[PDB]
Homo-oligomer: 222 residues x 5
């Protein structure tokens, strides 16, 4: 992470040990579940890429998942290099402009990453960009491991609409798909894969029922 | 959040990462349960709107619930604007008076939010007002998801009064209803939806029995 | 809470957010169980009444229990007022002597509460006194909710003495009763409500057996 | 605990509230289990006797166990007094030499305890000595409450050697006995109280098999 | 651990108590499981060998495992001594060069360990080297205690590929074996020890199927 000192200067305040342990506990227990994506974002707020690489290193034991994340980072960096090409030869006496691998923290030191993070002329947020690249790698793992496709998800005959909705949405989240497919699924596949007892009522509600009105009406129905 | 420095000046001390992770853990596990409302209030004490927006952003994945909360904030702000209209043209060289969206932190920076929070002439508590608007959005979600209406709640024949009371009140909390309906329900629906074995005794207690005397008398009855 | 600065001066360092969340978690999960009493004492060490009122406010949703605690505080304060009556008219230029509601923090500010807490002439520990008043309110709730009276508690025929002792004592704790009734119960009701197989041995031990010798002798008996 | 200031001086930094809550949670849940002994040691590192007495006070509700611990402290102090008798009349203008109850923190203030802890001429570690006395009291409670003697511990016919070893050692730990009895038990009672299917193999291993070779060989056997 | 002061000087900031408690909780609950290896690495980041010895001391009660770790440290140190032999007689007025046991922290003080950790001429990372030696001792314990060999691991007939893969990999991790044996096992033993229903499909996928394509294809198959 980064701390400030009198005069407008900046320094490094390393990610703490019990914050890294928590990241490890969220990954080991939830096994790269959907919640692994947000837990990471928060435990990484105010931190720099070097420390994001330490967090991943502590969980490096997982290798199928860390292979997927590593692949993504290399790609995004290449695109950064393509759309932000070397401006030209570098005038000396200054810090080079950030390249794709520096955002990652593999070829670059934390101080250079902090100088960009707090560069008066044009500060580059090296820290937030890398977290996002890593979050696409974590999200793909969730979809890879997701145990149930949404089409299979259904309601126990005596099971209620709320728990079924909870399970149906859990999967829709991990199955990123697209937001429009989600709208069709949330307004139809929920009613279609439901049992008939609460469907009659989900149909009575009307057309384009909202979830607030689908849950209120089916409370106790079955 | 906000920190003070020598001379009476103020600065920003960002909400910490493991406090945001906890907010995420309370939402992911309890699934916008009733306890999500208080956990938030406490994890947000001493914090400013910008940081309240970060907490919500980490849990932004939940979208049906964050749609309900977002709707409420826009409304309250409009009412703030209606009852606290623009005083007139703004004399220059000073900070504008707070508008509805500034309390939210969408159109306004933290420093302006802190200057109001600690404005010597008329300090506006931008931070506490927004938390309350958000808490009405969270509370509506609890009632939307509540799995059981109180009328259905009853006592297992061999189940005791204490657990039944615990389940009956859990729902009464989430079903905000009104405090008077609560008094009628707490003094009648509890006895009526109970089994007859402990009801005989709940009737022996007398009229307007208090809970302290309804629980003491039915300890072991059944 | 209270912090000290160069010169012998004192200031306020508010109870932290994740300490308040823990108090909320202990109350929501244990449901005003016996452990709620000590958790509170510890999370309130070094804190002042204002902050004790914030902790209770976060859990204010619980109302039957907060009605019992509120009743007790008003009483103790009245007794404080009765045995520590207004000394007389107050010489001006100084802080008034503490009244019953100031100990609570309802009519008084934290600074006045801290000035008494650290008054050189006669410092009044406003903070510890209020916590105790609140702990009597919390303890009454535990006894109100206690699910099992000790007389009913018995040993499963195949159940051991240790678990039965654990359950028997759990209730004796919550059923404050008096320490002497406890001695009679701990030396008799334990043996009497036990099964006969381990009682024969609890009788062989001798008269006035101690728990250390009642548990050692019945390890494996049944 | 103890903090240092410019000039070589020392002060008191009280044990924090959420560290005391954890000690309470480890005692309430594990019920003076074996792990209560180490949890305490760690939560007490850098702390002084006064703060060790606060930790015990928060859990003072438990009284059979706190009676056993209290008895031990009085004894050890008496032995300290016997082998470290009053040197003679005390020259004035200095701090007295530590007595048995001062190590406990009952008759002595924290500052005196810190002056000894950091006495240039002959610093007495009042803090660590008392923790050890308390740990003998906690360890006796574990053995008092231990639910199963090792001789009874055996292997389910379909149960594996690893879980049986885990249960057999759990008890051997709490049953301090002596290290030699432990060696005889760990090399024999484990094989003798095992089922015959894995014993044949535990015998094939050879004589004086080590645990590393008893567990590797019986992995899958049964 | 180590802190820095004005002038470029360094000091010691001891490992905190609740960080040591967590290490104890991870060892007591997971019982020297695979996750014990990473939890340790993180809770030890920024710490020095003396503090790594305190963490191990708190869990010293476990003795079969601490015998395995202790054996390894002695060996690695001997190899350090062999490949980094005494340079010769030591010029006086300086700190000796680090020996094998100093890296451990048994014969050496923290200040000397910190002077090497931050030696301008040739800083020796005494802290990280010892953690690695300890991690080989912890990893051997995991393999010793591992309850299931991978060959036995199979898929319940109605069990899915994902959970079976999770269990199969859990063991492959703890059974360090070699990375090549892992590739053969991950591409064959998974399919071979699977049930026939999902194997038909795992065979349809093609030759050298990747896990991402073995999990996607068998989602719902069985
Ligand atoms: O606020 P956090 O980001 O969670 O950091 C906490 C916080 O210390 P700070 O207030 O200085 O940030 C804790 O205090 P509380 O917020 O709970 O009041 C403190 O715990 P203690 O008060 O018990 O000391 C703990 O410090 P530590 O882990 O050394 O005990 C430290 O956690 P981090 O060191 O990981 O930042
Ligand atoms: O013991 P740690 O490894 O340091 O983990 C702690 C532990 O959380 P859990 O009870 O969920 O395991 C703390 O509880 P205690 O050890 O103090 O009893 C809790 O701190 P609080 O009780 O004050 O809430 C905090 O959990 P959280 O941050 O979610 O509130 C969490 O710290 P980490 O999340 O950083 O691991």
């Amino acid at each position: 992470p980064v701390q400030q000192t009198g005069g407008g200067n900046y320094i490094h305040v390393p990610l703490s040990p019990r914050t890294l342990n928590a990241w490890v506990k969220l990954v080991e227990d939830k096994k790269f579940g959907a919640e692994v994506v947000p837990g990471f974002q928060a435990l990484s707020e105010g931190c720099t890429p070097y420390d994001i690489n330490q967090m991943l290193n502590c969980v490096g034991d997982h290798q199928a998942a860390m292979q997927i994340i590593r692949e993504i980072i290399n790609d995004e960096a290449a695109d950064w290099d393509a759309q932000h090409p070397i401006p030209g030869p570098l005038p000396a006496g200054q810090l080079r402009d950030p390249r794709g691998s520096d955002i990652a923290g593999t070829t670059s030191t934390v101080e250079e990453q902090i100088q960009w993070m707090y560069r008066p002329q044009n500060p580059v947020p090296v820290g937030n960009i890398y977290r996002r690249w890593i979050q696409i790698g974590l999200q793909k793992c969730v979809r890879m491991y997701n145990p149930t496709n949404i089409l299979d998800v259904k309601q126990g005959p005596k099971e209620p609409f709320q728990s079924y909705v909870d399970r149906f949405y859990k999967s829709l989240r991990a199955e990123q798909t697209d937001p429009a497919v989600k709208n069709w699924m949330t307004q139809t596949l929920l009613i279609q894969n439901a049992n008939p007892d609460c469907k009659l009522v989900l149909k009575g509600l009307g057309m384009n029922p909202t979830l607030e009105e689908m849950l209120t009406a089916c409370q106790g129905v079955g």
